[PDB]
Design a protein around this ligand. Structure first.
Ligand SMILES: *C(=O)/C=C/c1ccc(O)cc1
Length: 125
């Protein structure tokens, strides 16, 4: 395991040092998105929660292609306000239900350290 707690205040500093292999050792799901919502990184824990194959979803658009249930003011709307303003730090519960058993999760979205990149962190609740 790579020990990092979900919700930690300096999580973007800690994860800036990790390659794809180290991201797969986290205890929670982690997705890195660019400012248009395309998936740059997607770890093994996220694939275990959602059933998606991490290697196949890289390069797809999260809001248009992979996760249409997040195309809503409650999720995508918060993301796009964050990208526009250049700052984002929000945590909320949500249900993922597209082509899968509905699964309740806690989501934490936070701007990365790398300029136009954004994290989505996910844990079961
Ligand atoms: C709703 O369509 C949610 C889908 C989803 C959430 C998170 C993922 O990693 C993959 C699909």
């Amino acid at each position: 395991m790579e020990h990092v707690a979900f919700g930690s205040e300096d999580i973007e500093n800690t994860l800036a040092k990790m390659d794809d292999g180290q991201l797969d050792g986290l205890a929670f799901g982690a997705i890195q998105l660019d400012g248009d919502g395309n998936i740059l990184q997607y770890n093994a824990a996220e694939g275990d929660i959602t059933g998606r194959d991490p290697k196949q979803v890289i390069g797809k658009n999260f809001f248009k292609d992979v996760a249409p249930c997040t195309d809503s003011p409650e999720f995508y709307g918060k993301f796009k306000e964050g990208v526009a303003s250049g700052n984002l730090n929000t945590m909320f519960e949500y249900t993922f239900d597209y082509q899968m058993t509905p699964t309740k999760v806690k989501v934490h979205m936070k701007k990365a350290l790398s300029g136009d990149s954004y994290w989505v962190f996910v844990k079961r609740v």
